[PDB]
């Protein structure tokens, strides 16, 4: 186990903070909120999204061919 006071060494940093009863819990919730989640979404679409559409494409084509394999089967049997 590790306690405060024995964690690590810190040089010259000041930290100002404020009482919760003195500030808002939702500063600019929407004003600053939305823009940021856009920003984080943007920042990550390209690594998260691609594999999922790949699965998405393989899922719809996969069931497609499953029905068209049997149902479509006949087809032609002419004599």
């Amino acid at each position: 186990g590790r306690q405060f006071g024995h964690l690590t060494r810190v040089r010259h940093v000041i930290t100002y903070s404020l009482s919760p009863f003195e500030q808002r819990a939702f500063p600019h919730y929407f004003s600053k909120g939305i823009p940021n989640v856009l920003r984080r979404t943007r920042a990550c679409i390209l690594r998260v999204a691609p594999p999922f559409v790949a699965f998405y494409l393989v899922y719809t084509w996969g069931t497609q061919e499953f029905e068209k394999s049997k149902r479509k089967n006949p087809a032609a049997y002419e004599n």
């Binding site: 810190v10 040089r11 940093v13 000041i14 930290t15 100002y16 903070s17 404020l18 009482s19 003195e22």
Partner: protein
């Protein structure tokens, strides 16, 4: 110029108090005060209104971390009432 202007701004009679304690007699003090201090507010200012605006208090916290010091100092306080409030006692 910054100085002299603060001087004239603030070193005005109604804000000064000649005080003394010991082997004196009050009359002698008054005489002196009237002899060496007469003529300080021979000019009561037009619109210089040295009034103290009340000061907001803030439940807040400042931490100056420095693990190079051998011992820590902490100071915690709550808002007090001020000089004149009987609550002081």
């Amino acid at each position: 110029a910054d100085l002299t202007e603060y001087l004239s701004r603030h070193y005005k009679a109604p804000r000064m108090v000649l005080a003394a304690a010991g082997g004196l007699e009050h009359r002698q003090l008054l005489d002196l005060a009237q002899k060496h201090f007469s003529g300080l507010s021979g000019t009561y200012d037009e619109d210089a209104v040295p009034t103290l605006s009340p000061c907001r208090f803030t439940g807040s916290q400042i931490c100056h971390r420095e693990d190079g010091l051998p011992l820590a100092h902490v100071a915690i306080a709550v808002e007090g009432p001020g000089w004149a409030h009987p609550d002081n006692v």
